[PDB]
Design a protein around this ligand. Structure first.
Ligand SMILES: CCCCCCCCCCCCCCCCCC(=O)OC[C@H](CO[C@@H]1O[C@H](CO[C@H]2O[C@H](CO)[C@H](O)[C@H](O)[C@H]2O)[C@H](O)[C@H](O)[C@H]1O)OC(=O)CCCCCCCCCCCCCCCCC
Ligand code: CLA
Ligand code: CLA
Ligand code: CLA
Ligand code: CLA
Ligand code: CLA
Ligand SMILES: CC1=C(/C=C/C(C)=C/C=C/C(C)=C/C=C/C=C(C)/C=C/C=C(C)/C=C/C2=C(C)CCCC2(C)C)C(C)(C)CCC1
Ligand SMILES: CC1=C(/C=C/C(C)=C/C=C/C(C)=C/C=C/C=C(C)/C=C/C=C(C)/C=C/C2=C(C)CCCC2(C)C)C(C)(C)CCC1
Ligand SMILES: CCCCCCCCCCCCO[C@@H]1O[C@H](CO)[C@@H](O[C@H]2O[C@H](CO)[C@@H](O)[C@H](O)[C@H]2O)[C@H](O)[C@H]1O
Ligand SMILES: CCCCCCCCCCCCO[C@@H]1O[C@H](CO)[C@@H](O[C@H]2O[C@H](CO)[C@@H](O)[C@H](O)[C@H]2O)[C@H](O)[C@H]1O
Ligand SMILES: CCCCCCCCCCCCO[C@@H]1O[C@H](CO)[C@@H](O[C@H]2O[C@H](CO)[C@@H](O)[C@H](O)[C@H]2O)[C@H](O)[C@H]1O
Ligand SMILES: CCCCCCCCCCCCO[C@@H]1O[C@H](CO)[C@@H](O[C@H]2O[C@H](CO)[C@@H](O)[C@H](O)[C@H]2O)[C@H](O)[C@H]1O
Ligand code: OEX
Ligand SMILES: [Ca+2]
Ligand SMILES: [Ca+2]
Ligand SMILES: [Cl-]
Ligand SMILES: [Cl-]
Lengths: 450, 37, 242, 30, 95, 32, 334, 135, 37
């Protein structure tokens, strides 16, 4: 394998392109990178644990990995309070140790092992143009991916459960016993409009639906893996697609960009898979919590929060949504589709219920609204929390902000990568990725436009 | 905080997450050692 | 709607609709002549809107023009608590107490005029004719209600002039800043007349439903214009506690 | 009537665009 | 011309706490008034004379002594609906 | 604290390691 | 030879005056719909209740606006992120009052510009060109997506999207500075580097080429006539340009490779706009610019102001006056 | 100037007494403030209820007055309304209720004393302390 | 409004289907270069 520009045609800054047809060294690069990923998981988790203050809420400490563990129902109890730090520590250590095994394997394959696996094995040797084998690899991975989804299912059903923020009697780890197998609900979720009030799959709001989804996902992924191992690409797909390593990279880049945008939206809007007791309030929650907090204060001062018109003529604390639902007043009117386990007790069939808002408020609801309102996912780049005009004494940026901003940026740059590699794969398949041939420049044989 | 038996290697834990950045920089260091061929 | 959840009515415009007495009966809520009956969840659904055009002539009839609501399904008063008080002479008194008893509504009149108004039943006291011993089809509460200003005293116009806030002059024109009568905002308290004609009574559950006709002034824009006369027709529903 | 002036200048701009595209000097290889 | 709240400010409403128009934050200055006693006073308004702020149903000994010790901080003007409508006496939009 | 000293010491070790590996591989004619 | 094949050949034809392509079969209807609705709205649309407090804003020329002040007003805050097509309104006048033209125009525009990017790739493919002009075009596409889609999504309302007008754009920027301190965000700083440098390099390259043109004309004619469309030979001496520029600064700060130079010219503003697009896109989730308010304290603990504090005073001034009637609670949470 | 002895001299009781926080105690009180109270008491405000702020006039107008160290320490043990009427233990952070306020459960009496002292000294270092939410 | 909704849905579905069936119809072969693939 050439490791210079004269032997490969690729400069040092495009050096990893020299691995396109070196399957052994490419496999080494891949396993060592996987090692990097697992290393970060373990090391960052151990950092978060060493920096963790167990009594202080998770979203106040710059944590993004321990919230993921706690949502899975490890190390936490009711309302997300930490019972034991050891499960987080164990998760970190196991990732950190496995990272070394993957690093070794990667450095081995990248440096010492065969540069090309074609000779060595028919099983591991692949040619980019060999559609049957590339679909075999798709299939083996689809079966492991579906197995991982079923691993989530098993943890939620048979191995202690997962954190259900919607649990009766307060949020807590719950064992899911009736996951939603009904394909109408599960796939209906896929068919919901990605706009306010519906939210496509972002609006999944119960662990039963999430778990039933992962049973379907595991089943569909395992079936698709078996299909791809026992089949070959059909004619229409053989004709509409580019069959090359860079092409497959560009396809995966498009998929990754889509998933990055989706993850950004998920963490920003959904509080079921991302519980607010770990991730802090969504911005919709913080706005509604502000409206609620001053609803309670003013009501306790004796105001009629129902019949109090604001300076504009709309109700100061309560109004109607454009479809008539009773909602919180003020600019929060935009977040009237927000659902939260501390709010939903005060909602009637018509929306917010006056009888409930006048008699059934609880101190935990007021405390929760105060906490969520003061932890609005608003903050500066140097982590000065609250609105940008505030002074420097509050060190807080929401984990939702960090995760959403990061994955939007990564999704966008991966869309750019998709375009880069998809256009390059197309041009290289067609044979003009290196520039225009002077003798057969196509425009010289095309008629003038005018 | 880390469990009490591990509070010794706490300064090591604080400097672990950064290492992949050092991997990205080490790619450049090795290229410079080979003269960016 | 009695068995519908929030997730079943949301986004469907069924939250702005008045409940309806199902059991089609012509019942009668019996009344002792010297007692008080609480009204729990009073709802008024406006269905028709009429604005009195002001012809340029002074002897032509004004006439009421229908309008189209520019705002959406945000036109309903609901969850209103009232009382029915019985005079010694059989008079029934409706006394709305609180609730979501106002909704700002904007209607468009033919020819492009936007007329917002403060649709309300605030402090309504309606009385029937003396001599009632039951709440039946003949009950018709007629009375006055208060119509507060459409814009609050905290409201700021586009040049930041307001009543207890904002400038008291036209700051964009320093030399002519005290020329404009609109520099003085007022929020005078208007009056409406409402009639509640009760048409269906369900004595087994104390429910009353009917039709209403309201008459009230429109928004004046902190006194920037004379208010138009708005006529609102629609249906209402209530439950009487016995 | 200032509305007429604004629409007229905008229309002149758009019509210039149309003519510049539909009737441009044809680029020729010489 | 002056609008009605500005004209109100020309009267005694601009000098002392007005039992019929001043919002609940203006009672913060009297020790032990905000929020409960100020709430009860604003709830039982209007008042025809300052003295009859002592005749609010359900008042206890502590609140009566507290009101009598501060009678001279109180004035009574006609209720202006520009300060009362919409529960402005509890929340005029000032934080 | 001796902690700022320990953190900087570990960080210096980790920083030197990679360049040291490249330096050893270059000095000893390794497969760089 | 089939009719579908004939249609495919026409669509992908490189002899059409304007290339259509498959991406064009989407670009043309969407952009035409957006242009028609935009022109009609900008001229004639009635006022829009942007802030959802029943305070309609006049955006159209016929309602008193000039070209500078006119805009298509974003849809009502009461709508939030709800999908609001024409067939969800009980009348076109309700649709207009709530800012439906904004949703129609922006959605069709967004689709149209993504299709324009795809179309650029498509024509490059049909012409046998290299494929990355669309990558450069993805920078303005990203910025437009940030202001029309991502920022509204993060803030929770299409009412927070950039208005389709000049003064509406300034309002958006001012409000954005007041709530996010975009001036003190490093990604905006890279965007300013991108645009200042893009203009700097455009001027530099243009001036160096123009300075180094090969003599081909007489002094009575435009020097541009010294170039013939389609000529084999280079029209300026890059060697002379490099000699001048490498003496203006130093030899190693000057490009001798036109390919390397034209790459740099493309990459610098494109990267800078990608950063600024991502900056706007991340402040959509309220990850704002740097906050240095009261960062410097003296020994007693008194605040020593810096220029950032004065900037913060300007921001507070903007913030307390914006949407003067829309806030009922003390904190502007969105 | 430096953080003088007169700057850290604050009323201990209403009976006229004064105490001086040490620089260590002022720093500690500031640290607890920044770590536990700024989410709501940024720059002496109160985001959830700015009718009751941490300004000197406001602290002095409470019942009993809260412009001395001991009253503040008591308030953080057993919080009440602005008039001393209603129980606020389940509504305001305090050390008496570690079940609902776990963040405060490790703050000792010295720590609460320090944060009360800081709360009393901060208004002397900033004119905008205890102002309007936007100011 | 229902008539308009159905019209818009028909038009959009036709254009989207035209896009999909176009890029499915051997689009890689429609180029001036190698067209075997
Ligand atoms: C390929 C096809 C492309 C074209 C096909 C159609 C175009 C779709 C493009 C996206 C359009 C979204 C616009 C409005 C987004 C929105 O209202 O909001 C976002 C929605 C999420 O919807 C929200 O979903 C929420 C669900 O939460 C609900 O349920 C939760 C459950 O825990 C909580 O309880 C919560 O409180 C409760 O409200 C609510 O319903 C909100 O009201 C609702 O708005 O995103 C979603 O549905 C799905 C996520 C879409 C991601 C799009 C963002 C990025 C787009 C690409 C960027 C390209 C940039 C590159 C430039 C070059
Ligand atoms: C995820 C990051 C990553 C990975 C896994 C790889 C992997 C690879 N690169 Mg790429 N590369 C990268 C980033 C990466 N690269 C970047 C960022 C650049 C730009 C600077 C390049 C530029 C580049 C060029 C120019 C070339 C490669 C080549 C290669 C391949 C041969 C490597 C070789 O012979 O180097 C030899 C290097 C050494 C012997 C130096 C030591 C390297 C080891 C791995 C250090 C490991 C230290 C680690 C801490 C040990 C832990 C041990 C234990 C704990 C497990 C290899 C598969 C070459 C190729 O394509 O081959 C055909 C090639 O020519 N790369
Ligand atoms: C998905 C990725 C992700 C996310 C969301 C977070 C989020 C967070 N981390 Mg983590 N972290 C990550 C990856 C991530 N991190 C990685 C990869 C490392 C290894 C270096 C770390 C190491 C780390 C440490 C050691 C610490 C954190 C901390 C934090 C918190 C504060 C962050 C802060 O102040 O940033 C400041 C913001 C910046 C430095 C901005 C970075 C700007 C980047 C470089 C721009 C690049 C964009 C783009 C891709 C450029 C491409 C250009 C080209 C394509 C054109 C926050 C919860 C802190 C914390 O609170 O811990 C408890 C902390 O101490 N993180
Ligand atoms: C994606 C990962 C991957 C892939 C595809 C391969 C593939 C290959 N390796 Mg490599 N290798 C890897 C990772 C990988 N390796 C890692 C991480 C290490 C470090 C331990 C090594 C170390 C290594 C050495 C030292 C050698 C190979 C060799 C080989 C070849 C023959 C393997 C064999 O014996 O047949 C099939 C082997 C088995 C069926 C038994 C092994 C299966 C594993 C150990 C158990 C299941 C994996 C895991 C524990 C369960 C799931 C993983 C989890 C993350 C979900 C083949 C090309 C050999 C070679 O080059 O021959 C010429 C050789 O000498 N590999
Ligand atoms: C990572 C997973 C993965 C990957 C890479 C592939 C890859 C492939 N599959 Mg396989 N497949 C998978 C999972 C996967 N599959 C699973 C899990 C199943 C089980 C359901 C199947 C079942 C399956 C069948 C039954 C077939 C394939 C076929 C194919 C080939 C062409 C498909 C194609 O053109 O797609 C592109 C998709 C289209 C051209 C369809 C047009 C759809 C329009 C454009 C709407 C698209 C939606 C919109 C753009 C995105 C909205 C976003 C949101 C929904 C996420 C290709 C090799 C085909 C083949 O040749 O078989 C061997 C085939 O017939 N797959
Ligand atoms: C899994 C995803 C993936 C994979 C496997 C590849 C793989 C490849 N790409 Mg692609 N690429 C991707 C994503 C991906 N890319 C994305 C997302 C983009 C958009 C930004 C691109 C844009 C891109 C271009 C423009 C080019 C490639 C090229 C290549 C080839 C050579 C790459 C190389 O040697 O880099 C060497 C690595 C470096 C020089 C290091 C880059 C350093 C960057 C600037 C740092 C990024 C910020 C980082 C997070 C650090 C921030 C911290 C900071 C404070 C220090 C190789 C086949 C080249 C090609 O076409 O070859 C055929 C090529 O010219 N890629
Ligand atoms: C190929 C290549 C590359 C790459 C590489 C890589 C990517 C690698 C990886 C690797 C890796 C990925 C590594 C890993 C490792 C790790 C380790 C070595 C581990 C360790 C561990 C430990 C030791 C632990 C301990 C502990 C415990 C147990 C508990 C807690 C505490 C502590 C932490 C102490 C580059 C770019 C350079 C270029 C050239 C070529
Ligand atoms: C788990 C879960 C769940 C579930 C989910 C699911 C069930 C899933 C599914 C999903 C899916 C089901 C997916 C899909 C996808 C799609 C796509 C992504 C596609 C694409 C396509 C393409 C890419 C194409 C292309 C093309 C065209 C356009 C035409 C021609 C040419 C070509 C071929 C190129 C739920 C939500 C319940 C809950 C939560 C959890
Ligand atoms: C969803 C499933 C899609 C199946 C579409 C193709 C069916 C497979 C039959 O086999 C395929 O027939 C197609 C006709 O379209 C031929 O073309 C291919 O040579 C062959 O691979
Ligand atoms: C005190 C000032 C600080 C100076 C800053 C130093 C920065 C310079 C380092 C950047 C590049 C380092 O890596 C650089 O790559 C070149 C490629 O030409 C390598 O390659 C070089 O190898 C040998 C020397 O060993 C040279 O004869 C050959 O001409 C060249 O190819 C060198 O090993 C090194 O010069
Ligand atoms: C195909 C190309 C042609 C484009 C389509 C043409 C349809 C657009 C209709 C507008 C044409 C002018 O027609 C009419 O103009 C007046 C002048 O402002 C508008 O009038 C509107 O504004 C004026 C003043 O701002 C108000 O006094 C009036 O009450 C209001 O309705 C009417 O609403 C509109 O119906
Ligand atoms: C050619 C490519 C594919 C094109 C095929 C698409 C054809 C269009 C079919 C769907 C369009 C009409 O779809 C139909 O619209 C009406 C809107 O009036 C919806 O009606 C919905 O809202 C209306 C009023 O807003 C309510 O009275 C009704 O209760 C509710 O269901 C129906 O739920 C939907 O089934
Ligand atoms: O809409 Mn447009 O500007 Ca976004 O922050 Mn909240 O909301 Mn309203 O206030 Mn500031
Ligand atoms: Ca540490
Ligand atoms: Ca806290
Ligand atoms: Cl504004
Ligand atoms: Cl508000």
């Amino acid at each position: 394998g050439g490791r210079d520009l004269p032997s490969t045609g690729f400069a040092w800054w495009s050096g990893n392109a020299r691995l396109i047809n070196l399957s052994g060294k490419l496999l080494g690069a891949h396993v060592a990178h996987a090692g990097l990923i697992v290393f970060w998981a373990g090391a960052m988790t151990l950092f978060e644990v060493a920096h963790f203050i167990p009594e202080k809420p998770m979203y106040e400490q710059g944590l993004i990995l321990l919230p993921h563990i706690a949502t899975l129902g490890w190390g936490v109890g009711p309302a997300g309070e930490v019972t034991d730090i050891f499960p987080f520590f164990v998760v970190g250590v196991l990732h950190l140790i496995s990272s070394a095994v993957l690093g070794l394997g990667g450095i081995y394959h990248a440096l010492r092992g065969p540069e090309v696996l074609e000779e060595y094995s028919s099983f591991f040797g692949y040619d980019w143009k060999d559609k049957n084998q590339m679909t075999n690899i798709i299939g083996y991975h689809l079966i492991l991916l579906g197995c991982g989804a079923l691993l989530l299912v098993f943890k939620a059903m048979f191995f202690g459960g997962v954190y259900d923020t919607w649990a009766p009697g307060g949020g807590d780890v719950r064992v899911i016993t009736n996951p939603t197998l009904n394909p109408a609900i599960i796939f209906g979720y896929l068919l919901k409009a990605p706009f306010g009030g519906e939210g496509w799959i972002i609006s999944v709001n119960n662990m039963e639906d999430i778990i039933g989804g992962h049973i379907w996902i595991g089943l569909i992924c395992i079936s698709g893996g078996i299909w791809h191992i026992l089949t070959k690409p059909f004619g229409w797909a053989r004709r509409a697609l580019i069959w090359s390593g860079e092409a497959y990279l560009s396809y995966s880049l498009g998929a990754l960009s889509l998933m990055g945008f989706i993850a950004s939206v998920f963490v920003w809007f959904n509080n079921t898979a991302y519980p607010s007791e770990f991730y802090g309030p969504t911005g919709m929650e913080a706005s509604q919590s502000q409206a609620f907090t001053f609803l309670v204060r003013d009501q306790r001062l004796g105001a009629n929060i129902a019949s109090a018109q604001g300076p504009t003529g709309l109700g100061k604390y309560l109004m109607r949504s454009p479809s008539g639902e009773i909602i919180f007043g003020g600019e929060t009117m935009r977040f009237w589709d927000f659902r939260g386990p501390w709010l939903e007790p005060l909602r009637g069939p018509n929306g917010l219920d006056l009888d409930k808002l006048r008699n059934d408020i609880q101190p935990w609801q007021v405390r929760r609204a105060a906490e969520y309102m003061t932890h609005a996912p608003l903050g500066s780049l140097n982590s000065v929390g609250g609105v940008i005009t505030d002074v420097n004494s509050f060190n807080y940026v929401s984990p939702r902000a960090w995760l959403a901003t990061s994955h939007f940026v990564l999704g966008f740059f991966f869309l750019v990568g998709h375009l880069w590699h998809a256009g390059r794969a197309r041009a290289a398949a067609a044979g003009f990725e290196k520039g225009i041939d002077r003798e057969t420049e196509p425009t010289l044989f095309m008629p003038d436009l005018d | 905080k880390l469990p009490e038996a591990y509070q010794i290697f706490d300064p090591l834990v604080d400097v672990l997450p950064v290492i992949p950045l050092f991997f990205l920089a080490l790619a450049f260091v090795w290229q410079a050692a080979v003269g960016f061929k | 709607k009695s068995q519908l959840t929030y997730d079943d009515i949301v986004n469907t415009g069924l939250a702005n609709v008045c409940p309806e007495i199902s059991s089609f009966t012509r019942g009668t809520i019996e009344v002792e002549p010297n007692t008080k009956y609480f009204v729990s969840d009073f709802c008024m659904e406006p269905q028709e809107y009429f604005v009195k055009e002001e012809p340029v002539n002074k002897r032509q009839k004004a006439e009421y023009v229908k309008g189209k609501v520019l705002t959406r399904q945000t036109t309903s008063l609901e969850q209103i608590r009232g009382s029915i008080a019985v005079g010694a002479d059989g008079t029934l008194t409706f006394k709305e107490k609180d609730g979501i008893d106002f909704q700002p509504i904007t209607v468009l009149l033919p020819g492009g005029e936007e007329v917002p108004f403060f649709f309300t039943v605030k402090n309504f006291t309606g009385t029937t004719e003396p001599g009632f011993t039951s709440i039946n089809s003949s009950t018709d509460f007629v009375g006055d209600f208060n119509v507060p200003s459409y814009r609050g005293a905290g409201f700021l116009d586009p040049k930041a002039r307001g009543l207890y806030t904002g400038y008291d002059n036209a700051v964009a024109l320093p030399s002519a800043a005290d020329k404009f009568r609109t520099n003085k905002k007022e929020t005078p308290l208007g009056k409406g007349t409402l009639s509640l004609q009760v048409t269906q009574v369900d004595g087994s559950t104390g429910e009353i439903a009917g039709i209403f006709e309201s008459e009230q002034p429109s928004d004046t824009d902190l006194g920037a214009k004379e208010p138009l006369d708005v006529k609102v027709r629609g249906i209402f529903y209530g439950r009487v506690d016995t | 009537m200032e509305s007429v002036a604004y629409i007229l200048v905008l229309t002149m701009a758009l019509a210039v665009l149309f003519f510049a595209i539909a009737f441009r000097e044809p680029p020729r290889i010489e | 011309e002056l609008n009605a709240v500005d004209a109100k400010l020309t009267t005694d409403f601009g000098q002392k706490i007005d039992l019929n128009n001043s919002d609940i934050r203006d009672f913060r200055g009297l020790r032990g008034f905000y929020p409960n006693l100020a709430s009860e006073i604003i709830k039982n308004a209007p008042y025809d004379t300052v003295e009859e702020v002592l005749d609010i149903p359900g008042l206890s000994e502590t609140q009566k002594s507290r009101l009598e010790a501060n009678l001279g901080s109180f004035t009574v003007t006609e209720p202006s609906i520009e300060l009362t409508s919409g529960d402005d006496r509890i929340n005029p939009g000032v934080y | 604290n001796l902690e700022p000293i320990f953190q900087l010491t570990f960080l210096g070790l980790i920083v030197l390691a990679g360049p040291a590996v490249v330096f050893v591989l270059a000095f000893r004619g390794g497969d760089l | 030879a089939s009719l579908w094949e004939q249609f495919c050949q026409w669509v992908t034809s490189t002899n059409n005056r304007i290339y259509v392509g498959w991406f064009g079969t989407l670009m043309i209807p969407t952009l035409l719909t957006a242009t028609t609705c935009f022109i009609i709205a900008f001229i004639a649309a009635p006022p829009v209740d942007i802030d959802g407090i029943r305070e309609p804003v006049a955006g159209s020329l016929l309602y008193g606006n000039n070209i500078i002040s006119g805009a298509v007003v974003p849809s009502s805050n009461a709508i939030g992120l709800h999908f609001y097509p024409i067939w969800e309104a009980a009348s076109l006048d309700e649709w207009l009052y709530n800012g439906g033209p904004y949703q129609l125009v922006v959605f069709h525009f967004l689709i149209g510009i993504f299709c324009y990017m795809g179309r650029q790739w498509e024509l490059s493919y049909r012409l046998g060109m290299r494929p990355w002009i669309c990558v450069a075009y993805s920078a303005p596409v990203s910025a437009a997506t940030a202001v029309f889609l991502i920022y509204p999504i993060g803030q929770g309302s299409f009412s927070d999207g950039m208005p389709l007008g000049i003064s509406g754009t300034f309002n958006f920027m001012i409000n954005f500075q007041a709530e996010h301190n975009i001036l003190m965000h490093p990604f905006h700083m890279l965007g300013v580097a991108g645009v200042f440098g893009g203009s700097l390099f455009s001027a530099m390259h243009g001036s160096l080429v123009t300075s180094s043109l090969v003599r081909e004309t007489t002094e009575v004619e435009s020097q541009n006539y010294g170039y013939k469309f389609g000529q084999e030979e280079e029209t300026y001496n890059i060697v002379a340009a490099h000699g001048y520029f490498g003496r203006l600064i130093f030899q190693y700060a000057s490009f001798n490779n036109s390919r390397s130079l034209h790459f740099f010219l493309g990459a610098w503003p494109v990267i800078g706009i990608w950063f600024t697009a991502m900056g706007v896109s991340t402040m959509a989730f309220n990850l704002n610019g740097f906050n240095f308010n009261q960062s410097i304290l003296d020994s007693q603990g008194r605040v020593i102001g810096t220029w950032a504090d004065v900037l913060n005073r300007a921001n507070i001034g903007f913030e307390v006056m914006h949407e003067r009637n829309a806030h009922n609670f003390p904190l502007d949470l969105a | 100037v430096e953080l003088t002895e007169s700057t850290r001299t604050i009323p201990l009781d209403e009976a006229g007494g004064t105490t001086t926080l040490t620089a260590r105690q002022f720093t500690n009180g500031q640290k607890i403030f920044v770590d536990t109270c700024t989410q709501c008491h940024l720059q002496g405000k109160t985001k959830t209820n700015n009718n009751v702020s941490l300004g000197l006039a406001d602290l002095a107008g409470a019942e009993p007055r809260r412009d001395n160290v001991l009253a503040l320490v008591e308030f953080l043990k057993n919080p009440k309304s602005y008039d001393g009427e209603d129980d606020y233990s389940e509504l305001h952070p305090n050390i008496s209720r570690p079940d609902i306020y776990p963040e405060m459960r490790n703050y000792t009496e010295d720590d609460i004393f320090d944060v009360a002292g800081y709360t009393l000294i901060a208004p002397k270092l900033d004119e905008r302390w205890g102002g309007t939410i936007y100011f | 409004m229902l008539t308009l909704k159905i019209a818009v849905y028909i038009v959009v579905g036709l254009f989207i289907s035209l896009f999909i069936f176009g890029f499915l119809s051997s689009d890689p072969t429609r180029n001036p270069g190698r067209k075997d693939f």
